[PDB]
């Protein structure tokens, strides 16, 4: 039951406002992951929604 959250493994500085900038340890709920290897995510730190690179996050066990 419930959801799986994801955590940033590394800092990332976005180059476009479509993408989130984030810091190691930030957590996200994934809004959509069905379109490719960048995923639409909702940061629990900033409340923002934007694309994140899937190789920079891992599921929180």
């Amino acid at each position: 039951g419930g959801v799986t959250l994801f955590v940033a493994l590394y800092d990332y500085e976005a180059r476009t406002e479509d993408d989130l900038s984030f810091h190691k340890g930030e957590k996200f709920q994934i809004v959509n992951n069905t379109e490719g290897d960048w995923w639409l995510a909702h940061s629990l730190t900033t409340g923002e929604t934007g694309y994140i690179p899937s190789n920079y996050v891992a599921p929180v066990d």
Binding site: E35, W38, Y51, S54
Partner: peptide, 12 residues
């Protein structure tokens, strides 16, 4: 490519 399908950044 759509936003989801752009190349990924290299790992640090």
């Amino acid at each position: 490519v759509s936003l989801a399908r752009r190349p990924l950044p290299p790992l640090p």
